[PDB]
Design a protein around this ligand. Structure first.
Ligand code: DAB
Ligand code: NA
Ligand code: NA
Ligand code: ZN
Length: 866
């Protein structure tokens, strides 16, 4: 498989301006006719090269003339001797039912649907499958009426007919030119929830949400979230929907979460269907986030698209930032920021220190589906958020307006977006552009000094980014470094220098730089990198007391949580080194007191308390260490949880009882009380056994929603309580026929701390609700074991690696995209001790010798073995 390079981008030799598609649909053999109006921009002797994969060509005509000047090659139809303008007509066959990879046109249960991003359209017909080619589509679909009474494609329904033999057809027309990755087609039988939204200028938009028959009762929340998304985009960005219908289809067999096809989003039903007894608060909030994200793509993705795939972050960073601002405006900003930062420090940082590290705008790519990554998305969004921090809201919105003004209707690059922000705001972003082309996480070291004679505080800040596997050369970045200085009463000390106020967002642009502040009338406690104002690691020598003081006084809730994380980091590292020497947990009394203070503070927002009482996950704990000891980390997390359960037992039970709510509401204050209550329950599960067992079975049996029941069932598994098997068996008996609900149970099984967890997980491959043909089930059972049970996955006898090797041997042929999500834990081998490295290397050598090794796995395995 061959690498492609961003520096090789060239404008295409041919454009397509319009395409008329006819699908004669059938699950075994679908016939596709594609009539394209084309224009040659390059030399008369450059042929038209169309991408195509697994297509059976039936005919080629140019202006209606059967064409003899063509040939098929590896992945392409190359057509010569073309005039300057012509109609290309292609007829080809494909086979949806054989498509197990779920790319192109495939079968989802009884429905047919598509996935074309990034490069799936070439699995449907020969085309210029690249996002700088934009064309007006019209799509005519012909199918069996009893099996496919709904026939959907992008845009408006412009024609319909009946035929003999029980067939019918529908034609669709989408007036906006689109690159073909945004093409969609859905055929099948659905219940439809219909509603309307009226934009602020008075366009009425029909909203339609297609779900499997019998599922209409799980649809209103997605519909509500959609209207909330459309309203928010109007109020915050000034953006209205641009068409008359908005369709969403929920399908069960989907690889990528959800997809922004113009006017016809396709969603994994995991991000549509919610009922209070099947879905948790976190499901509700993810449904809202993903409905928003795909809706926000309508502008940042669809009206302005990507010139080439290396520009994926242009739409993803910007749309993730938009879905974050959305969730944050509607819910708790601090809680959102906190969870986004946990993802950054615990999952994205690890990727940026792995063999797959890449800049948010990659330079080289073998399989473009490997690059739907935490880096492109989440670090991409941190990059957009730093532009926001540097510009302020008003300038940022002006940049947005300029970007759409210059680029509405075409494919753009990241550099174009930066340039629009720079021109509209007058803030210079040429050094800042380096965040697009450099990978790895910067490390920012802060030293400080307080001068009592001059009342001056001096920060000496330095940065460097260690080399990564992909780039030997690294340079300083333009790092926005926000600070606050606190006096002894907890009040903010005004930042100033030489009689002039100073912006508290410092511009750290050099390897090393000093900043001096005047009129600092008391020795300050600093809050550093506030609101995680750049995605960097902070190295600063805090005292425990500086941290507990920030916990008590910092102005922003994010800083309070974050001071608590640095407080815990020190003791997490101490206790991991202790675990390696055979020693028990050691924690000073004053740290346990700081969390007691949080439990009993009556003014603190419960949402904030809940987050401070949620320990760093094993993945965030892993980023504290050069070499990861996954067993020590897991046992330490447990023991820390037992220690605080013991020390704070009375406080925990009291706060748990005070936050009891008899009504269930999907409302931010209620969610917050419920999160705090279940964070308490989790500790209680780890205290005295008998009481634990009682609290937990009791919550499980009395819960009136899946949030409270799952938190119980989950604490029973984690703490291996006596009632565990009985509760687990009840959930199976009640929920087995429901895949989305069972996913939560597979997750608990996969991440259990029980000694025989691998054995159970292997037995679950045979379970009535598991199947290898469904990505959601594969991820819930196998991916959760490999990626979320690191203690068991990295068992010393290497049984975890062998297991993943068997599964990936199946998946490499069945569904390479899912194979490639699942291999990720094995490609981190260099973070582990020599003996685990050697087995992981052996497992990767084994996969490397597979017969038809997919490009997706090939790219990752060779970077890992390098
Ligand atoms: N655009 C690809 C699909 C992905 N889940 C997204 O919404 O960005
Ligand atoms: Na808010
Ligand atoms: Na100092
Ligand atoms: Zn997206």
């Amino acid at each position: 498989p061959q690498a492609k390079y961003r520096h090789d981008y060239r404008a295409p030799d041919y454009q397509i301006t319009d395409i008329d598609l006819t699908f004669d649909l059938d699950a075994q053999k679908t016939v596709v006719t594609a009539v394209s109006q084309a224009v040659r921009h390059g030399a008369s002797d450059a042929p038209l090269r169309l991408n195509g994969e697994d297509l059976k060509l039936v005919s080629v005509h140019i202006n209606d003339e059967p064409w003899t000047a063509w040939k098929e090659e590896e992945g392409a139809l190359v057509i010569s001797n073309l005039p300057e303008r012509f109609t290309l007509k292609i007829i080809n066959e494909i086979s949806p039912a054989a498509n197990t990879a779920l790319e192109g046109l495939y079968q989802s249960g009884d429905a047919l649907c598509t996935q074309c991003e990034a490069e799936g359209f070439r699995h449907i017909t020969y085309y210029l499958d690249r996002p700088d080619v934009l064309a007006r589509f019209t799509t005519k679909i012909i199918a069996d009426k009893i099996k496919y009474p709904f026939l959907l494609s992008n845009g408006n329904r412009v024609a319909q007919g009946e035929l003999e033999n029980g067939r019918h057809w529908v034609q669709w027309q989408d007036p906006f030119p689109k690159p073909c990755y945004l093409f969609a087609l859905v055929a099948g039988d659905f219940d439809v929830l219909r509603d309307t939204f009226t934009t602020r200028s008075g366009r009425e938009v029909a909203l339609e949400l297609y779900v499997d028959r019998g599922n209409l009762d799980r649809a209103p929340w997605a519909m509500t979230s959609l209207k909330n998304s459309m309203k928010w985009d109007e109020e915050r960005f000034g953006l209205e929907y641009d068409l008359d219908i908005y369709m969403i289809v929920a399908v069960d067999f989907f690889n990528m979460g959800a997809m922004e096809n113009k006017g016809l989003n396709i969603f994994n039903s995991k991000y549509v269907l919610a009922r209070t007894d099947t879905a948790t608060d976190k499901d509700y909030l993810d449904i809202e986030r993903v409905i928003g994200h795909e809706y926000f793509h309508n502008w940042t993705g669809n009206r302005v698209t990507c010139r080439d795939w290396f520009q994926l972050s242009l739409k993803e960073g910007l749309t993730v930032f938009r879905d974050q601002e959305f969730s944050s405006d509607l819910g708790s900003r601090a809680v959102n920021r906190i969870n986004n930062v946990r993802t950054m420090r615990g999952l994205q940082f690890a990727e940026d220190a792995s063999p797959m590290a890449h800049p948010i705008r990659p330079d080289m790519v073998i399989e473009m589906n490997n690059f739907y990554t935490l880096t492109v998305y989440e670090k991409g969004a941190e990059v957009i958020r730093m532009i926001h921090t540097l510009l302020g809201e008003e300038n940022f919105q002006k940049g947005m307006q300029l970007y759409f003004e210059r680029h509405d209707g075409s494919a753009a690059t990241c550099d174009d977006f930066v340039q629009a922000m720079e021109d509209a705001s007058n803030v210079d972003l040429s050094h800042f552009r380096r965040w697009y082309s450099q990978s790895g996480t910067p490390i920012v070291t802060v030293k400080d000094d307080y001068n009592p004679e001059t009342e001056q505080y001096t920060l000496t800040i330095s940065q460097r980014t260690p080399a990564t596997p992909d780039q030997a050369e690294k340079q300083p970045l333009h790092i926005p470094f926000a600070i606050e200085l606190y006096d002894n009463e907890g009040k903010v000390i005004p930042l100033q220098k030489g009689g002039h106020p100073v912006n508290s967002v410092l511009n750290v642009t050099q390897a090393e730089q000093t900043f001096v502040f005047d009129n600092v009338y008391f020795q300050p406690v600093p809050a550093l990198l506030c609101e995680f104002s750049a995605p960097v690691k902070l190295e600063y020598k805090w005292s425990d007391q500086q941290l507990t003081f920030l916990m008590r006084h910092a102005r922003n809730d994010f800083s309070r949580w974050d001071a608590a994380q640095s407080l815990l980091a020190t003791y997490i590292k101490l206790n991991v080194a202790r675990h390696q020497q055979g020693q028990p947990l050691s924690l000073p009394v004053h740290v346990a007191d700081a969390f007691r203070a949080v439990l009993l503070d009556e003014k603190i927002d419960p949402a904030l308390a809940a987050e401070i009482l949620t320990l760093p996950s094993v993945n965030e704990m892993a980023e504290l260490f050069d070499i990861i000891d996954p067993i020590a980390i897991a046992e330490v997390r447990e023991a820390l949880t037992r220690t605080l359960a013991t020390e704070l037992a009375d406080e925990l039970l009291a706060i748990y009882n005070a936050n009891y709510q008899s009504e269930y509401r999907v409302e931010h204050e209620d969610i917050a009380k419920r999160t705090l209550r279940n964070a308490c329950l989790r500790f209680l599960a780890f205290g005295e056994t008998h009481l634990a067992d009682v609290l937990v079975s009791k919550q499980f049996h009395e819960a009136n929603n899946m949030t409270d029941a799952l938190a119980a069932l989950s604490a029973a598994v984690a703490a291996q309580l006596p009632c565990r098997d009985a509760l687990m068996q009840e959930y199976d008996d009640k929920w087995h026929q429901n895949g989305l609900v069972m996913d939560k149970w597979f997750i608990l099984q996969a991440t259990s701390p029980a000694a025989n967890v691998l054995e159970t997980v292997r037995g679950l491959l045979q379970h009535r609700s598991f199947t290898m043909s469904n990505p959601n089930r594969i991820r819930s059972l196998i991916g959760a074991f490999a990626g979320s049970n690191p203690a068991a996955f990295h068992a010393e006898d290497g049984s975890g690696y062998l297991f993943l090797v068997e599964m990936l041997t199946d998946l490499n042929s069945r569904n390479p995209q899912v194979a490639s999500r699942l291999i990720e834990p094995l490609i981190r081998l260099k973070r582990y001790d020599a003996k685990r490295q050697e087995k992981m290397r052996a497992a990767l050598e084994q996969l490397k010798g597979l017969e038809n090794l997919s490009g997706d796995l090939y790219e990752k395995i060779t970077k890992a073995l390098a």
